[PDB]
Design brief:
mainly alpha, globular, 4 helices, binds chloride ion, allergen, three-stranded antiparallel sheet, 3 strands, binds cobalt (II) ion, Lysozyme
Length: about 130
């Protein structure tokens, strides 16, 4: 599923991401935009052999099991394919573990490089939340 911006913002709010660990909703929408272009089916292979999955490009080295990443820790205890669902629940639940791990949203390189320090409120402007 390719979400609309406001549609995604609303789904994220319902799943409790607004101000989760102090990160306002716009941060999460901005991260999803640049990681996946709001497409739940996005996959991208990394240089280390791991793969990133779904709307928030969650990695198979640490977070989910794709059966082809040796030494994967699967800390979200899920198959990576679960993260490609039109239902974002699994992605959101795993993202909450990731942002809690100590580096906050810096765990998402796209967020650090393209969202951090910008007017992220723009990402939810106009939306009926
Ligand atoms: Cl933080
Ligand atoms: Co990535």
């Amino acid at each position: 599923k390719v979400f609309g911006r406001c549609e995604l913002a609303a789904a994220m709010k319902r799943h409790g991401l607004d101000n989760y660990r102090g990160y306002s909703l716009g941060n999460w929408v901005c991260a999803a935009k640049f990681e996946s272009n709001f497409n739940t089916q996005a996959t991208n292979r990394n240089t280390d052999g791991s793969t990133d999955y779904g709307i928030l490009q969650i990695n198979s080295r640490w977070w989910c099991n794709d059966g082809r990443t040796p030494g994967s820790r699967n800390l979200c205890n899920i198959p990576c394919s679960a993260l490609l669902s039109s239902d974002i629940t699994a992605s959101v639940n795993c993202a909450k573990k990731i942002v809690s791990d100590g580096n906050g949203m810096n765990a998402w390189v796209a967020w650090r490089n393209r969202c951090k320090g910008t007017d992220v409120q723009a990402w939810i402007r106009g939306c009926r939340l």
